[PDB]
From a paper:
[name], which is also identified as the [name] domain-containing adaptor protein ([name]), is essential for the [name] and TLR2 signaling pathways. [name] acts as a bridge adaptor to recruit the MyD88 molecule to the activated [name] dimer on the plasma membrane. The C-terminus (residues 80–221) of [name], referred to as [name]-[name], is the [name] domain and is required for interactions with [name], TLR2 and MyD88. The overall structure of [name]-[name] consists of a central five-stranded parallel sheet (βA-βE) surrounded by four helices (αA, αC-αE) on both sides.
Among these, [name], E132K, R143Q and E190D have been reported to cause a loss of function in [name]. The [name] mutation has also been shown to impair recruitment of MyD88 to the plasma membrane and to influence the post-translational modification of [name]. To further understand the molecular mechanism underlying these associations in the [name]-[name] mutants [name] and S180L, we determined the crystal structures of these mutants. These structures showed that neither mutation interferes with the overall structure of the [name] domain. We also found that the surface electronic potential map and hydrophobicity of the [name]-[name] [name] mutant does not obviously differ from that of the wild-type protein. Our observations are inconsistent with the recent conclusion based on an in silico model that the [name] mutant fails to associate directly with MyD88 because this mutation affects the distribution of negative charge on the MyD88 binding site of [name]. Our direct binding assay also showed that [name]-[name] D96A retains the same binding affinity to MyD88-[name] and [name]-[name] as that observed in wild type, and the [name] mutant is capable of binding with MyD88-[name]. Additionally, the D96E mutant, which retains the negative charge at that position, results in the complete loss of NF-κB activation. Thus, we conclude that the loss of function in [name] [name] is not caused by interference with the interaction between [name] and MyD88 but instead by another mechanism, such as altered post-translational modification of [name]. We also showed that [name] and L165A can bind normally to MyD88-[name].
Numbering used by the authors:
A (entry chain A), B (entry chain A): 79 to 109, 128 to 221
């Protein structure tokens, strides 16, 4: 529960087709929030899933999404799904009973994503 | 890890539109395997997800699917996805990196599902 139990405060999960949008989010989050793009050995307090059409199509992305929700946001974790570039009708059904940020919100949803991240950090020692 | 730590050996997860197919599976599993249809207070060793078009469309089904994979099949659990009545092209992408039974297999996939259930039970005291 210690703020320093992890070296990063948040990492962004994205598919290869959204590399630039991910970098913008990382840049937006760090303006202090220490962020980076998620990687294999990546371990942070919060994980932002940049869910886009490309992401939803990629099997590995979906798998990472699953595990990101398996051991995390049950209550003790922090996983923030950002639905971007998608029609709400194409949103993953399971989201109706889960927290997530809509890309149509202010700042492409970045503002609410950052806010959600900060809220979690405060609950840390 | 005790075979009697749970009152049921397996329960079937289905959407309202597949009630009959679920009952057939339950019936098939018990011919000893103690099975039933999954319910809110339901707790068993294995959980069979009867994934069909209706299931994939229903938000609550998907959510239950998620949680069924969140705390389960990481290694210590038992969750068996049965893809039935669907074109493989419409299968959830995350399945490419996970175990699952195809409905096109022998006995509508029931045989392999039962086998998978038994395998898990043996690993129990």
């Amino acid at each position: 529960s210690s703020r320093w139990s992890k070296d990063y405060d948040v990492c962004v999960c994205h598919s290869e087709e959204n590399l630039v949008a991910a970098q913008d989010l990382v840049s937006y989050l760090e303006g202090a929030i220490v962020s980076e793009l998620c990687q294999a050995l990546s371990s942070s307090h919060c994980r932002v899933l940049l869910i886009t059409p490309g992401f939803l199509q990629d099997p590995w992305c979906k798998y990472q999404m699953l595990q990101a929700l398996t051991e995390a946001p049950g209550a003790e974790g922090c996983t923030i799904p950002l639905l971007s570039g998608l029609s709400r009708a194409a949103y993953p059904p399971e989201l109706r009973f889960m927290y997530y940020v809509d890309g149509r919100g202010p700042d492409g949803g970045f503002r609410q994503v950052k806010e959600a991240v900060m809220r979690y950090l405060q609950t840390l020692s």
